[PDB]
Amino acid sequence: MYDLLVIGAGPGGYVAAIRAAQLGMKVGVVEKEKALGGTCLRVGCIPSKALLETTERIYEAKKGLLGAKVKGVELDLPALMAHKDKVVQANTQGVEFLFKKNGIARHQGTARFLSERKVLVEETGEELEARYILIATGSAPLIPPWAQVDYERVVTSTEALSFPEVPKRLIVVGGGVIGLELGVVWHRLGAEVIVLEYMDRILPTMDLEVSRAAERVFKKQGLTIRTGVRVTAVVPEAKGARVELEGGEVLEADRVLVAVGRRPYTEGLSLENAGLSTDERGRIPVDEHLRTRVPHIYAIGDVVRGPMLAHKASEEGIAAVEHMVRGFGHVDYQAIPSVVYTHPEIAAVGYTEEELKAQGIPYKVGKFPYSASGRARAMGETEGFIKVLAHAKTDRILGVHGIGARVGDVLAEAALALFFKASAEDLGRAPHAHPSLSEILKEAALAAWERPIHL
Amino acid sequence: MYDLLVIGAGPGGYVAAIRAAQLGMKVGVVEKEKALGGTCLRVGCIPSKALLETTERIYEAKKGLLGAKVKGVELDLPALMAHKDKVVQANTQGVEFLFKKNGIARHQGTARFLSERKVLVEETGEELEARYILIATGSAPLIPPWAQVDYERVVTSTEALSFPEVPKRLIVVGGGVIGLELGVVWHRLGAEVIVLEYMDRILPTMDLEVSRAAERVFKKQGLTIRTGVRVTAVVPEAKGARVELEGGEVLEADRVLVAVGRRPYTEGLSLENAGLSTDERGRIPVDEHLRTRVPHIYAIGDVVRGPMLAHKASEEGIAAVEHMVRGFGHVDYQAIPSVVYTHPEIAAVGYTEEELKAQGIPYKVGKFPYSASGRARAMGETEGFIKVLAHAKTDRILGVHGIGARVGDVLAEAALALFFKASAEDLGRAPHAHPSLSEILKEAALAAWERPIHL
Numbered sequence: 043m044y045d046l047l048v049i050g051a052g053p054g055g056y057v058a059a060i061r062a063a064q065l066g067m068k069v070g071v072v073e074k075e076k077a078l079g080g081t082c083l084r085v086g087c088i089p090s091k092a093l094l095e096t097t098e099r100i101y102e103a104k105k106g107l108l109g110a111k112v113k114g115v116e117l118d119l120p121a122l123m124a125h126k127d128k129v130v131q132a133n134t135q136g137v138e139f140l141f142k143k144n145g146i147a148r149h150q151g152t153a154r155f156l157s158e159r160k161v162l163v164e165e166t167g168e169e170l171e172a173r174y175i176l177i178a179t180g181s182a183p184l185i186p187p188w189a190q191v192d193y194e195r196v197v198t199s200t201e202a203l204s205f206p207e208v209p210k211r212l213i214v215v216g217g218g219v220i221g222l223e224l225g226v227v228w229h230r231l232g233a234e235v236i237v238l239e240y241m242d243r244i245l246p247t248m249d250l251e252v253s254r255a256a257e258r259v260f261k262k263q264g265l266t267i268r269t270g271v272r273v274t275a276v277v278p279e280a281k282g283a284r285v286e287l288e289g290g291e292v293l294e295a296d297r298v299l300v301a302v303g304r305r306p307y308t309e310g311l312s313l314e315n316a317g318l319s320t321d322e323r324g325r326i327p328v329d330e331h332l333r334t335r336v337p338h339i340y341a342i343g344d345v346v347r348g349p350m351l352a353h354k355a356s357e358e359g360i361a362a363v364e365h366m367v368r369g370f371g372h373v374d375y376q377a378i379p380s381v382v383y384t385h386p387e388i389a390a391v392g393y394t395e396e397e398l399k400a401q402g403i404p405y406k407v408g409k410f411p412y413s414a415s416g417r418a419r420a421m422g423e424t425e426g427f428i429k430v431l432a433h434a435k436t437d438r439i440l441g442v443h444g445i446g447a448r449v450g451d452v453l454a455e456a457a458l459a460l461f462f463k464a465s466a467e468d469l470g471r472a473p474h475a476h477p478s479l480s481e482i483l484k485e486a487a488l489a490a491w492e493r494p495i496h497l
Numbered sequence: 498m499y500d501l502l503v504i505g506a507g508p509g510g511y512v513a514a515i516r517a518a519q520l521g522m523k524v525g526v527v528e529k530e531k532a533l534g535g536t537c538l539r540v541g542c543i544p545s546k547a548l549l550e551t552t553e554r555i556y557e558a559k560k561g562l563l564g565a566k567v568k569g570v571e572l573d574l575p576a577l578m579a580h581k582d583k584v585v586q587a588n589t590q591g592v593e594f595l596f597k598k599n600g601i602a603r604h605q606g607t608a609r610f611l612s613e614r615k616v617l618v619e620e621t622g623e624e625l626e627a628r629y630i631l632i633a634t635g636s637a638p639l640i641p642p643w644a645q646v647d648y649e650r651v652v653t654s655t656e657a658l659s660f661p662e663v664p665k666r667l668i669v670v671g672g673g674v675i676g677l678e679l680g681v682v683w684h685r686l687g688a689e690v691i692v693l694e695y696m697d698r699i700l701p702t703m704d705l706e707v708s709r710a711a712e713r714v715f716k717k718q719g720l721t722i723r724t725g726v727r728v729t730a731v732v733p734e735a736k737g738a739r740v741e742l743e744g745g746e747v748l749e750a751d752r753v754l755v756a757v758g759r760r761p762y763t764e765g766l767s768l769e770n771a772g773l774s775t776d777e778r779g780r781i782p783v784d785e786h787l788r789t790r791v792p793h794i795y796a797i798g799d800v801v802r803g804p805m806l807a808h809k810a811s812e813e814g815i816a817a818v819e820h821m822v823r824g825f826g827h828v829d830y831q832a833i834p835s836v837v838y839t840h841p842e843i844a845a846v847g848y849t850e851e852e853l854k855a856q857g858i859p860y861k862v863g864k865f866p867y868s869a870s871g872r873a874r875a876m877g878e879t880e881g882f883i884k885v886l887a888h889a890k891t892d893r894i895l896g897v898h899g900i901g902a903r904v905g906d907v908l909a910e911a912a913l914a915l916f917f918k919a920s921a922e923d924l925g926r927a928p929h930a931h932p933s934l935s936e937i938l939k940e941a942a943l944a945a946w947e948r949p950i951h952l
């Protein structure tokens with residue numbers, strides 16, 4: 043039998059499988075979709091970043107380039123979508139390559155538990171046994187009952203990656219990362235975009251300061267952002283769709299993207315046959331080693347608690363399989379960055395000010411603006427900042443947060459510093475290339491420690 | 498009198514002055530040029546990066562943007578140069594702001610030693626005394642006797658930042674960082690550029706594998722690069738200039754940039770009156786705390802040994818003044834990155850393979866290509882790599898090197914890892930955002946340690 047059977051071939055599942063193979067396990071993977079790579083590769087991170095990177099270049103050329111006159115920039119939607127598809131194709135084929143290289147067996151079908159040690163692949167009729175089972179079934183779009191999604195006029199993120207033309211009017215229901223990113227993609231191509239959010243801010247996982255800054259920037263760019271608004275219905279119409287709000291207001295658009303969250307996905311898994319159940323939010327409860335209540339069955343990624351991120355899922359996959367083989371594993375949740383791939387980028391790592399205040403932890407704030415950065419100035423960027431939060435007594439970095447050009451790339455270093463349990467002093471004293479955006483992080487760190495040089 | 502008198506207001510001097518004021522010293526600074534910021538801000542890092550960032554965007558638009566049909570792009574050189582000037586001016590005014598904020602006194606003129614403790618500001622006639630003196634006089638372009646520089650047709654980097662029109666043909670004599678960067682700027686604007694280097698490689702401070710890749714990339718972009726050639730004369734002509742090579746070959750061009758290096762600058766300083774002298778290369782010898790042989794006189798930056806980089810100078814400035822006040826101070830030379838701000842960027846930190854082999858240090862190589870990167874592919878980038886060198890016994894990161902889009906940004910993280918004396922395993926295990934160019938570093942690190950997930 044298998045040593046490890048993995049259900050799902052997303053970031054969590056497929057990386058777990060490769061690591062397990064590296065540890066000497068005989069591994070099988072069941073995935074119901076034809077291509078490997080999960081939500082992230084097929085309809086998530088990869089296609090969305092393809093669209094974001096390319097539209098960003100297009101948008102900047104349309105606004106004008108410093109030192110030049112651009113005579114014309116015409117969207118070529120077939121070419122834009124072809125690039126997206128080619129990037130996805132290359133990535134999924136890469137996972138296939140790595141499975142074959144690492145000797146990982148793959149089954150195509152919906153895995154369903156028969157017992158705690160046996161799983162049916164419903165399509166092939168195969169019954170598979172394993173010593174360890176790793177549930178990595180991911181998530182799915184949350185579709186509230188009031189949202190009548192027809193996958194045409196009222197859509198999820200998947201269809202929003204592939205609109206057959208630019209929507210004259212797009213409404214995004216939900217002010218989270220996914221909807222905002224896709225809102226920006228189509229706004230750059232000429233769509234009038236309106237974002238509706240029930241909560242009193244967008245990007246709720248970010249530090250409040252960063253959420254507020256993000257809203258200002260996107261409004262300046264020309265998106266309409268409306269927080270504190272409860273959508274009561276979304277209904278398709280003949281050649282568009284309407285969005286009803288609490289109080290009677292009705293908005294009309296050509297497409298409406300329903301992006302109010304994602305829910306852990308366990309449909310068709312028959313968890314009950316393994317002696318398992320989901321909690322109130324649909325998650326599979328796990329302990330600190332990612333074991334369910336049945337000790338040889340682990341769960342990771344979007345199907346369990348924690349930030350619904352690809353690299354969160356993969357790190358949990360690594361820790362789970364390392365625990366299976368060695369009896370020890372661990373994920374440093376405080377070193378996992380969360381990034382929004384708009385321009386400017388928006389990011390968070392470690393604790394927000396809100397979380398520190400709630401936990402009663404005393405801290406110092408260090409902040410350095412992009413306006414004081416030589417490199418940012420050189421690029422024609424002036425807006426944004428990075429903020430370092432450090433413990434008031436120990437100087438330990440507790441969190442790093444920012445908004446600005448490439449801030450996600452810059453905060454890669456911040457995540458490393460957190461992983462290294464760095465002090466603000468040590469981050470700020472470390473050499474940083476001049477002139478570079480990393481110097482913004484350096485000065486922010488110095489400011490948290492004591493004082494910066496350049497403020 | 499002053500506690501500290503600093504000679505030179507470049508990255509070394511001006512940062513040292515701010516740090517010194519922070520430590521409670523009474524500080525004066527003598528600078529002969531009207532504007533503060535030194536070579537770097539006035540005629541170096543800042544103007545060159547302004548030109549590089551802006552021409553990069555113009556050049557991409559000329560080549561075509563993914564998902565668009567782009568018409569021809571028309572250069573506006575007055576607008577390009579206006580941006581450069583505006584960036585420089587904001588940066589030099591920033592230094593003025595910080596001097597005033599920190600209570601640093603400034604003198605305009607050439608400093609010249611009268612004794613070990615007294616310095617004449619020649620143009621104001623002031624005789625200035627100090628407890629500590631910090632020589633941060635920088636460097637100047639190396640002009641070999643065979644190069645007849647008239648600062649019009651045959652020029653240094655300073656004039657090459659401000660050519661009145663795009664030269665139809667530009668020849669760059671010297672294949673180092675500064676010449677290559679400026680060659681690329683004008684090439685993007687339509688110049689036929691030829692780079693001549695005496696050594697058998699360009700970018701001699703890079704890892705040899707990286708130098709070779711750089712040569713291939715720039716040739717493919719359309720630069721002519723000729724290594725192994727000795728220029729024997731450069732002479733201005735009426736409407737151009739000629740470059741003679743050993744053996745009789747003569748090249749002709751509209752402008753010739755002589756960028757064969759920079760030399761430590763101590764002209765007019767009368768070092769001998771301080772009881773000091775320069776070595777054979779023109780450097781001021783210093784000990785491990787940056788003291789000259791006269792222990793209250795320190796020297797830093799381009800005027801002393803080590804990489805001639807702005808952040809190297811400023812770090813030595815911090816270390817020198819922390820030694821004056823506290824008797825501490827430290828510079829981690831192994832963590833200082835050297836970056837070339839072309840596209841793709843080119844970078845090095847810590848030891849090259851050549852240095853490791855020369856020193857007999859056993860090491861492992863880990864390499865991950867941009868071709869395997871999800872984020873890189875989404876951007877339309879496929880070329881380049883990052884390479885991590887780790888000690889064969891201890892797994893200590895010894896060096897990190899790369900070429901690729903934004904590789905300098907990515908290697909900010911590598912510099913931090915080196916500063917923390919971390920292992921390849923430490924770096925490779927750290928969470929990294931997906932999809933991001935930083936994952937290229939992560940996978941290279943894991944490959945150095947043992948094996949990556951994605952190869």
Ligand SMILES: Cc1cc2nc3c(=O)[nH]c(=O)nc-3n(C[C@H](O)[C@H](O)[C@H](O)COP(=O)(O)OP(=O)(O)OC[C@H]3O[C@@H](n4cnc5c(N)ncnc54)[C@H](O)[C@@H]3O)c2cc1C
Nearest residue numbers: 050052054074080081082086087153180343344350351352
């Ligand atoms: C548009 C969009 C953009 C995103 N952008 C980013 C981003 O840039 N960065 C980031 O970190 N995250 C991003 N995400 C989130 C990211 O996609 C998820 O966090 C990630 O995919 C979670 O990985 P996972 O392995 O837990 O689950 P998934 O990637 O969802 O994989 C689960 C797999 O399990 C399969 N499956 C489920 N049940 C069964 C069954 N019973 N039998 C067989 N197979 C089954 C599914 O077909 C699926 O392929 C984005 C998401 C969306 C939709």
Ligand SMILES: Cc1cc2nc3c(=O)[nH]c(=O)nc-3n(C[C@H](O)[C@H](O)[C@H](O)COP(=O)(O)OP(=O)(O)OC[C@H]3O[C@@H](n4cnc5c(N)ncnc54)[C@H](O)[C@@H]3O)c2cc1C
Nearest residue numbers: 505507509529535536537541542608635798799805806807
């Ligand atoms: C075109 C170009 C591009 C560059 N790009 C980069 C890059 O992007 N990144 C990087 O790290 N480095 C770059 N550099 C190198 C960088 O400029 C130097 O490493 C840096 O300026 C060194 O700082 P410093 O303080 O030692 O000397 P400097 O910046 O040269 O400052 C010395 C100052 O001392 C003054 N001075 C000298 N003698 C006297 C005297 N006796 N009295 C009064 N004043 C005096 C000079 O006028 C000068 O302003 C570049 C250089 C060039 C020219």
